[PDB]
mmCIF file of C-alpha atoms in Angstrom:
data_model
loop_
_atom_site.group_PDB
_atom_site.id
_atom_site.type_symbol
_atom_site.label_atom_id
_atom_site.label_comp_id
_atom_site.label_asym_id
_atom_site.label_seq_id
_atom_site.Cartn_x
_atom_site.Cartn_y
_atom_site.Cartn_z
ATOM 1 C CA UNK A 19 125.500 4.344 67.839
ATOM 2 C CA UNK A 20 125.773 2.677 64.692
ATOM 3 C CA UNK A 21 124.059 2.043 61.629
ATOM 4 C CA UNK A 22 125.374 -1.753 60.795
ATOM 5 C CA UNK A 23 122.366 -2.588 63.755
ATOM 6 C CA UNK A 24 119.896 0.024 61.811
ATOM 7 C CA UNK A 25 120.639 -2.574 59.093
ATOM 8 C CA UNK A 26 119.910 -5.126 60.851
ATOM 9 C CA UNK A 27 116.762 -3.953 61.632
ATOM 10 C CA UNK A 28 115.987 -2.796 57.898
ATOM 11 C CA UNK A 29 115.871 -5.864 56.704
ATOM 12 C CA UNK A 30 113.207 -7.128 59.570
ATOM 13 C CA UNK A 31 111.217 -4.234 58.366
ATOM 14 C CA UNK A 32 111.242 -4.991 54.647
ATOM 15 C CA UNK A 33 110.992 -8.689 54.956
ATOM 16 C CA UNK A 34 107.882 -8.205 57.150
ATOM 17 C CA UNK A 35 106.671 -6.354 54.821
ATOM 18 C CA UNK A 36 107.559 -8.866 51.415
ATOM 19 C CA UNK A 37 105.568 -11.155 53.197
ATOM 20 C CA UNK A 38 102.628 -9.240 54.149
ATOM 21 C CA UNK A 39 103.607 -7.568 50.800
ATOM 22 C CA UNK A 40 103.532 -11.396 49.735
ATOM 23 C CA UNK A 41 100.138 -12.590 51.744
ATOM 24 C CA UNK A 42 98.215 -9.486 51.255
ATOM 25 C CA UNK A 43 98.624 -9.807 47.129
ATOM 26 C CA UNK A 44 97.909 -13.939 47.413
ATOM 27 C CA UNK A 45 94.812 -12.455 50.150
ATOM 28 C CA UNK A 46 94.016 -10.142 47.579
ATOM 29 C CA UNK A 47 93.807 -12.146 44.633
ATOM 30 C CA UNK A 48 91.707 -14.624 46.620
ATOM 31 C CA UNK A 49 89.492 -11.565 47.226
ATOM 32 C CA UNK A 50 89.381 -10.943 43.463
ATOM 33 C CA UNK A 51 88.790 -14.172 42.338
ATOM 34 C CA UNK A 52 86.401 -14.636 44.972
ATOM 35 C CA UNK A 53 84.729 -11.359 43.785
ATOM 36 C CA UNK A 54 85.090 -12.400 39.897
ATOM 37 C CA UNK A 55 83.172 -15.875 41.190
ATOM 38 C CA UNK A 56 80.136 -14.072 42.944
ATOM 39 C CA UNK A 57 79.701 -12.084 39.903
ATOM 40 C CA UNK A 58 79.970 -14.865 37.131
ATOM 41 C CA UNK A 59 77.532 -17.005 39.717
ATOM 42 C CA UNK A 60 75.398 -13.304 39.905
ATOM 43 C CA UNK A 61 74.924 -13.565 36.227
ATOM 44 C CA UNK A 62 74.593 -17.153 36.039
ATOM 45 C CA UNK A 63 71.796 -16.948 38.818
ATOM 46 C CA UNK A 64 69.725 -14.259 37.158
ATOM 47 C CA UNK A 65 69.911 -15.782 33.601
ATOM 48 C CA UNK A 66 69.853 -19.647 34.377
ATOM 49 C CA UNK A 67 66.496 -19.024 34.593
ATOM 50 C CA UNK A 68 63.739 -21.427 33.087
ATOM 51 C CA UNK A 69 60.554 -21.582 31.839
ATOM 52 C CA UNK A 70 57.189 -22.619 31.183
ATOM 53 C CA UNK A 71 56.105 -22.507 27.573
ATOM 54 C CA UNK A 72 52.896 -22.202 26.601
ATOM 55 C CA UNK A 73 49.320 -24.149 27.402
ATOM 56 C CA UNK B 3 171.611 6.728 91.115
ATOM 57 C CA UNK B 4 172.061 5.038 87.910
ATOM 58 C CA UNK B 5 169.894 4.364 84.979
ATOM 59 C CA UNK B 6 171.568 1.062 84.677
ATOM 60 C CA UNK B 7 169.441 -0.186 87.117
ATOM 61 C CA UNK B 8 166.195 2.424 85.097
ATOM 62 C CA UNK B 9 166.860 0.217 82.253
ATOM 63 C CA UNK B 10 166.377 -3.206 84.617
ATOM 64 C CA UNK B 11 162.438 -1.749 84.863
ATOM 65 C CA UNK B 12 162.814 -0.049 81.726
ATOM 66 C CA UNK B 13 162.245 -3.493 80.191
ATOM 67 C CA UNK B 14 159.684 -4.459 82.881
ATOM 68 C CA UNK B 15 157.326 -1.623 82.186
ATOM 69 C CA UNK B 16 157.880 -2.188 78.145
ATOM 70 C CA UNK B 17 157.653 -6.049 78.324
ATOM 71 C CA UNK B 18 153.840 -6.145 80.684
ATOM 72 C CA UNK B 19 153.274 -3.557 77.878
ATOM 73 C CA UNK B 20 153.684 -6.081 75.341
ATOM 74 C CA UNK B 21 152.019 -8.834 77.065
ATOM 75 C CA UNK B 22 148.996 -6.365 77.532
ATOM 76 C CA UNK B 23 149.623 -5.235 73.946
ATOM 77 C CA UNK B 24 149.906 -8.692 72.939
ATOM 78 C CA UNK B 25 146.933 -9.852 74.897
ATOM 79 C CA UNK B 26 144.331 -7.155 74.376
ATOM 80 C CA UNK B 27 144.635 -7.784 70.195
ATOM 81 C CA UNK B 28 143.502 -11.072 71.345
ATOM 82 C CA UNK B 29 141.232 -10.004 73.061
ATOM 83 C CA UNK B 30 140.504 -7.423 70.463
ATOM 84 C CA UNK B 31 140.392 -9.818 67.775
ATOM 85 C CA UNK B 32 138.142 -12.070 69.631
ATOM 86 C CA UNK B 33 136.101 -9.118 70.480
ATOM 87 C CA UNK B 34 135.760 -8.111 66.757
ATOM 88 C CA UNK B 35 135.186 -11.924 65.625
ATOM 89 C CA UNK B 36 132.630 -12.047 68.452
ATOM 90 C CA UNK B 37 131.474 -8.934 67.309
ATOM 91 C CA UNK B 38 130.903 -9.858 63.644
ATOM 92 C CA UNK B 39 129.480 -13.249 64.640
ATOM 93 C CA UNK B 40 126.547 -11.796 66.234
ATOM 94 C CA UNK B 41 126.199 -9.781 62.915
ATOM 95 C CA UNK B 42 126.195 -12.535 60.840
ATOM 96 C CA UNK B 43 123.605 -14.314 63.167
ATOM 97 C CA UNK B 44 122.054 -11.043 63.296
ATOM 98 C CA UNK B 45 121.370 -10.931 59.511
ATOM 99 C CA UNK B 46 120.584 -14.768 59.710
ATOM 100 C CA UNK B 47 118.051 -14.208 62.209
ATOM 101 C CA UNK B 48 115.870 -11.720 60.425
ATOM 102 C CA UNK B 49 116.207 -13.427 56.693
ATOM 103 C CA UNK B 50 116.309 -17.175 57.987
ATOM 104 C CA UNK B 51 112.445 -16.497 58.160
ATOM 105 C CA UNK B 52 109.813 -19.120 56.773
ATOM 106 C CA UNK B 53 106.882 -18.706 54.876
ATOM 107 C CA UNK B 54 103.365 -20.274 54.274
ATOM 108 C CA UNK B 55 102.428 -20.007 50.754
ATOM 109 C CA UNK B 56 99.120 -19.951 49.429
ATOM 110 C CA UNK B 57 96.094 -21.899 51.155
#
């Protein structure tokens, strides 16, 4: 048994894991800016509000 | 009983050596040039790997 195939291996496991590495930060900043978006249109939905003035 | 006649096969059992000898590096090489093609494959397989970026 030899490692030279453990190698072989190693790299599936760490290149699987750049790209969910790679997907799950690109996912995750998605999910940030999503979350920044909700909040900015939170904000803008509370204060974008108008109003009758007077008689 | 002479070893005149020992020397006759003496040659016989040293020469299929050779042949053998001569043959199994071949096959030897072969087996290791085989051997490190699938390796090279191997690696090739794994890291070859494609990616969708972003949305």
């Amino acid at each position: 048994f030899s490692g030279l195939e453990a190698a072989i291996v190693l790299i599936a496991f760490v290149v699987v894991a750049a790209v969910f590495s790679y997907v799950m930060l690109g996912a995750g900043f998605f999910a940030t800016q999503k979350s920044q978006e909700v909040t900015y249109s939170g904000m803008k939905q509370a204060t974008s509000n108008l109003i009758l003035d007077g008689m």
